[PDB]
Amino acid sequence: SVLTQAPSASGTPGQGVTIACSGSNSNIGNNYVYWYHQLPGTAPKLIIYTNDQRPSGVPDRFSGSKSGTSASLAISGLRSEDEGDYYCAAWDDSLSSVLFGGGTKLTVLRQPKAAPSVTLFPPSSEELQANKATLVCLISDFYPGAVTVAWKADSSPVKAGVETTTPSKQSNNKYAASSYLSLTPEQWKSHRSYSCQVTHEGSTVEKTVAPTEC
Amino acid sequence: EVQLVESGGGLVQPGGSLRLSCVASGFTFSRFEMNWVRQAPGKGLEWVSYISNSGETQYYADSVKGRFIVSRDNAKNSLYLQMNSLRADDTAIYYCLVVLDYWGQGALVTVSSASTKGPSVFPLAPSSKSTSGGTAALGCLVKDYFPEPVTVSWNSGALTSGVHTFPAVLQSSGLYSLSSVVTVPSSSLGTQTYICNVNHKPSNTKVDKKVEPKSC
């Protein structure tokens, strides 16, 4: 069981946004939901506790609700100090554990949205002769600065050996990110293809490389 | 105000172990359950352990069961985390929490057997078909160095337009890797030399790597 959050939420200054948190009966369905705001580099701060309560100091522009197996955090009148990462959390009875959602990056939109382009490099001959293999997936020119990256060997997802950077700004004021898939020279030569899939807003773009081609 | 002060973090070797302490003030510590939560560099939040107000009940993440022990001393208003058999997946900032309400500023725990190591630099060759008309991306993969930082430049600083150098990933080995990419005219791949200049001062290593087109 996992708590599911969308990677990105956004609006222009003054707009409202809703951040969803979706779970199941073992957690959100029966247990209290908490929400946190984090600026990277510093610890999270409580935004909502016990589904819908606000601590002292959190403005009433923030409100939490829960229905069935889902919870949502509503933010009205978006301002710069609201930007950052938002996480939901809840106890899960089947796991006897506190689960966290994966985090939603909240962006106050300052420029038009922009879809990523993806470049995928196969392992270099140099690296292969060193008995190693890294696929390099470079993601560029997107806004807002939040993406999901997934890898496939042929047509099946692969999770092991993956590292992905947090997006940072390019010289043209859009965002870039990178992801790596580490393989053995054996795996690289034995599959027909490998792909990196990049999800941004409501598009997924996938690039593929094959060991038998340029 | 509520204050939670963590200590006891730092660098430790894999299989080793460490003792986090969290000292509480501004609330009746013994009334409240406590939790530990951690955050691997670049990643989300992951709960680690719960302990009841009296200390008699504990719960652990499956990722940590049998390896960590949470405890508390209500006479000293202190929460502890005994982390045994430390492994690279445990590298994270560790936060103490009162209930799920207030977080300490966090203590960094680094689990690595890495010593100083200069990078291996590999070329990211431009695809031969995007070398006729239009633009092409090429780059350098800077692999397996420790510690941070490295610097990357292109053509000794003469090439800056179209360059993006990415931040590093921290791998399960404890070593870092990053990449640098530059977009150039396809027509220049025949005539223009492209060299990435990598500098890793902690190991007193500099690497220049020529990036050439591949013969498909």
| Elucidated via | X-ray
> Are B106 and B176 part of one and the same domain?
no
Long-range (24+ apart) CB contacts under 8 A made by B1-4 are: B1/B26, B2/B26, B2/B27, B2/B98, B2/B101, B2/B102, B4/B96, B4/B97, B4/B98, B4/B102, B4/B103, B4/B104, B4/B105
Q: Which two tokens stand for residue A74?
A: 């509503």
Contacts of B161 (CB under 8 A, 6+ apart): none
State the greatest distance between any 2 C-alpha atoms of chain B, in Å, as a whole number: 75
Q: Is residue B64 part of a domain?
A: yes
Answer yes or no: are the C-beta atoms of B99 and B2 closer than 8 Å: no
Terminal alpha carbon distance of chain A: 41
Answer yes or no: are the C-beta atoms of B97 and B49 closer than 8 Å: no
Query: Is residue A212 classed as helix, strand or coil in its secondary structure?
Result: coil
* Contact assignment for A166 to B167 by CB distance below 8 Å: yes
Q: Which two tokens stand for residue B170?
A: 């921290």
Q: Chain B within 8 Å of A194 (Cβ-Cβ)?
A: no
Residues from chain A that touch B122, judged by Cβ atoms under 8 A, are: 124, 126-127, 134
Cα–Cα distance between A154 and A152 in angstroms, integer? 6
Long-range (24+ apart) CB contacts under 8 A made by A38-44 are: A38/A84, A38/A85, A38/A86, A38/A87, A38/A103, A38/B45, A39/A84, A39/A85, A40/A84, A40/A85, A40/A166, A42/B105, A43/B95, A43/B103, A43/B104, A43/B105, A43/B106, A44/A87, A44/B45, A44/B95, A44/B103
Its domain, for residue B172, covers 120-210
Which of B45, B122, B181 comes nearest A126 by C-beta? B122
Cα–Cα distance between A53 and A60 in angstroms, integer? 10
* Contact assignment for B177 to A163 by CB distance below 8 Å: yes
Please report the residues numbered 54 through 73 in chain A whose beta carbons come closer than 8 angstroms to any beta carbon of chain B.
55
Could you say which of B85, B111, B137 is where a domain stops? B111
> Are B15 and B94 part of one and the same domain?
yes
Q: Is residue B76 part of a domain?
A: yes
Please report the residues numbered 169 through 208 in chain B whose beta carbons come closer than 8 angstroms to any beta carbon of chain A.
169-171, 177-179, 181
Q: Is residue B216 part of a domain?
A: no
> Are B13 and B65 part of one and the same domain?
yes
DSSP secondary structure letters along B7-48: E--EEE-TT--EEEEEEEESS-GGGS-EEEEEE-TTS--EEE
Which of B100, B105, B214 comes nearest A89 by C-beta? B100
Please report the residues numbered 73 through 92 in chain A whose beta carbons come closer than 8 angstroms to any beta carbon of chain B.
87, 89
Answer yes or no: are the C-beta atoms of B83 and B18 closer than 8 Å: yes
Q: Which two tokens stand for residue B60?
A: 């652990």
Contacts of A104 (CB under 8 A, 6+ apart): A5, A6, A7, A8, A9, A19, A85, A86, A87
Residues from chain B that touch A95, judged by Cβ atoms under 8 A, are: 62
> Are B12 and B64 part of one and the same domain?
yes
Number of structural domains chain B divides into: 2
DSSP secondary structure letters along B115-168: --BPPEEEEEPPPGGGGSSSEEEEEEEEEEEBSS--EEEEGGGTB-TTEEEPPP
The residue behind tokens 């962006």 is: A107
Residues from chain B that touch A101, judged by Cβ atoms under 8 A, are: 44
Q: Which two tokens stand for residue A150?
A: 């997934």
Could you say which of B88, B111, B134 is where a domain stops? B111
Q: Which two tokens stand for residue B181?
A: 């990419």
Q: Which two tokens stand for residue B201?
A: 């001062």
Bridge partners, A33 (sequence order): A90
Bridge partners, B128 (sequence order): none
Which of B123, B127, B166 comes nearest A214 by C-beta? B127
Q: What is the DSSP letter of A48?
A: E
Which of A124, A168, A180 comes nearest B123 by C-beta? A124
Q: Which two tokens stand for residue B59?
A: 């719960």
Closest C-alpha to B122, from A166, A162, A122: A122
The residue behind tokens 């002060």 is: B5
- In chain A, where does DSSP find H-type helix? 125-129, 185-190
> Are B18 and B99 part of one and the same domain?
yes
Distance of CA A214 to the CA centre of its chain: 31
Q: Chain B within 8 Å of A173 (Cβ-Cβ)?
A: no
Q: For residue B163, what are the CA distances in angstroms to A139, A179, B54?
A: 13, 17, 57
Bridge partners, B109 (sequence order): B10, B92
Nearest-CA distance A178 → chain B (Å): 7
Domains in chain A, please, with CATH? Answer: 8-108 (2.60.40.10), 117-209 (2.60.40.10)
Cα-flanking dihedrals φ and ψ of residue A137, to 5°?
-110, 115
Residues from chain B that touch A43, judged by Cβ atoms under 8 A, are: 95, 103-106
CA atoms B122, B123, B124, B127: torsion sign: negative
Q: Which of A34, A148, A214 to mutate to test the interface with B (most CBs of B within 10 A)?
A: A214
> Are B23 and B66 part of one and the same domain?
yes
Q: Which two tokens stand for residue B119?
A: 């990078």
Query: Is residue A125 classed as helix, strand or coil in its secondary structure?
Result: helix
Q: Which two tokens stand for residue B172?
A: 């399960």
Q: For residue B78, what are the CA distances in angstroms to B7, B82, B151, B163, B211?
A: 11, 13, 42, 50, 56
Which of A42, A100, A126 comes nearest B46 by C-beta? A100
* Contact assignment for A136 to B35 by CB distance below 8 Å: no
Q: Which two tokens stand for residue B91?
A: 């590298």
Q: Is residue B215 part of a domain?
A: no
CB atoms within 10 A of CB B103: 23
Query: Is residue A127 classed as helix, strand or coil in its secondary structure?
Result: helix
* Contact assignment for A136 to B139 by CB distance below 8 Å: yes
Q: Chain B within 8 Å of A34 (Cβ-Cβ)?
A: yes
Answer yes or no: are the C-beta atoms of A182 and A140 closer than 8 Å: no
> Are B127 and B202 part of one and the same domain?
yes
Answer yes or no: are the C-beta atoms of B44 and B52 closer than 8 Å: no
Q: Which two tokens stand for residue B45?
A: 């939040």
Q: What is the DSSP letter of A214?
A: -
Terminal alpha carbon distance of chain B: 65
Q: Which two tokens stand for residue A60?
A: 């009433």
Could you say which of B91, B111, B131 is where a domain stops? B111
Q: For residue A164, what are the CA distances in angstroms to A120, A158, A200, B21, B166?
A: 13, 14, 15, 31, 11
Q: Which two tokens stand for residue A122?
A: 């196969």
Q: Which two tokens stand for residue B202?
A: 């902690």
Q: Bin A32: left if φ > 0, else alpha if -120 < ψ < 50, else beta.
A: beta
Amino acid in position B104: G
CATH number at residue B15: 2.60.40.10
DSSP secondary structure letters along A66-113: EETTEEEEEE-S--GGG-EEEEEEEEETTTTEEEE---EEEEE--S--
> Are B11 and B101 part of one and the same domain?
yes
Answer yes or no: are the C-beta atoms of B7 and B105 closer than 8 Å: no
> Are B91 and B16 part of one and the same domain?
yes
> Are B91 and B14 part of one and the same domain?
yes
Closest C-alpha to A181, from A137, A139, A125: A137
Size of interface A-B (CB pairs under 8 A): 113
* Contact assignment for B141 to A136 by CB distance below 8 Å: yes
Closest C-alpha to A9, from A138, A137, A102: A102
Cα-flanking dihedrals φ and ψ of residue B156, to 5°?
60, 30
Q: Which two tokens stand for residue A25?
A: 């009966």
Buried b (16+ CB within 10 A) or exposed e, B163-181: bbbbbbbbbbbbbbbbbbb
Please name the residue of chain A whose CA is at the shortest distance from the CA of residue B99: A49
Burial of A109 (0-12, 13-18, 19+ CB in 10 A): middle
Please name the residue of chain B whose CA is at the shortest distance from the CA of residue A98: B47
> Are B25 and B65 part of one and the same domain?
yes
> Are B98 and B137 part of one and the same domain?
no
